[PDB]
Amino acid sequence: AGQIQVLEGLEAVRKRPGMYIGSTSERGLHHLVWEIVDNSIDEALAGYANQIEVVIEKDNWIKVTDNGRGIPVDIQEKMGRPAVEVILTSSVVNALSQDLEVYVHRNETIYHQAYKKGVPQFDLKEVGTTDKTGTVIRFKADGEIFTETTVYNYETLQQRIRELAFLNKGIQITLRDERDEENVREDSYHYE
């Protein structure tokens, strides 16, 4: 029933990414991180998260982790599908990613799903157990969309992360660049 409105949202985002993110250039690539990080910052504003970690991984995957509630997994009556899957299939970031993965820690369970260009590659599954709550999102910007550059710039991430931790007092926000195994760089911000 409601599966059809989700697929027009993806085509739209992907024909006119600019309308959603400003550009398909370097600046838009970095907007993808800001979208995901803002969700984690809302977990902390809600009172649940206090730590957010942003990692630039090998082959320019971005990994964002928070220790908030974990995205819900309960079945939605209208879609018939887990809440996380609904949430992530209307995500601009996901649409503009050749690959995206989620891990949710919730209900003493670790759940996993992956997507390409916004489309679920398999059903939500329980892959492990946990005594923490939170959410991990890893995504790789789509080279068929980001046809100029899919390489992140550390100082641009660093700059904004620091401003965000300064604005949002009490949240520990860490940035790490792991792309060169031989020289890993980390900056961790925590105000008050």
Ligand X SMILES: CCCC(=O)Nc1sccc1C(N)=O
* Positions that interact with ligand X (CB under 6 A): 39-40, 43, 66, 68-69, 71-72, 87, 135
**Binding partner selected for residue 66 from Cl ion, ligand X, none, CB under the kind-specific 5 to 8 Å limit:** ligand X
Which residue, among 35, 41, 33, 94, has the nearest Cα to 66 in the 3D structure?
Answer: 41
Mapping DSSP to helix (H, G, I), strand (E, B) and coil, where does residue 30 land? helix
Distance CA 14, CA 176 (A): 29
Asked if 92 and 107 touch (Cβ cutoff 8 Å), the reply is no
Instruction: Rank residues 73 and 87 by Cβ distance to Cl ion and give the closer one.
Output: 73
Instruction: Rank residues 69 and 162 by Cβ distance to ligand X and give the closer one.
Output: 69
108 binds Cl ion (CB under 5 A): no
Stretch near Cl ion under the rule CB under 5 A, chosen from 47-55, 66-74, 128-136, 184-192: 66-74
Amino acid at 158: Q
What one-character DSSP code corresponds to residue 75? B
Please report which helix (H) or strand (E) contains residue 13, including its range.
helix 4-15
**Binding partner selected for residue 38 from Cl ion, ligand X, none, CB under the kind-specific 5 to 8 Å limit:** none
State how far Cα 127 lies from the chain centre: 19
Question: What mask of x and - would describe binding to Cl ion in positions 72 to 91, judged by CB under 5 A?
Answer: xxx-----------------
**Binding partner selected for residue 73 from ligand X, Cl ion, none, CB under the kind-specific 5 to 8 Å limit:** Cl ion
List of residues contacting Cl ion (CB under 5 A): 72-74
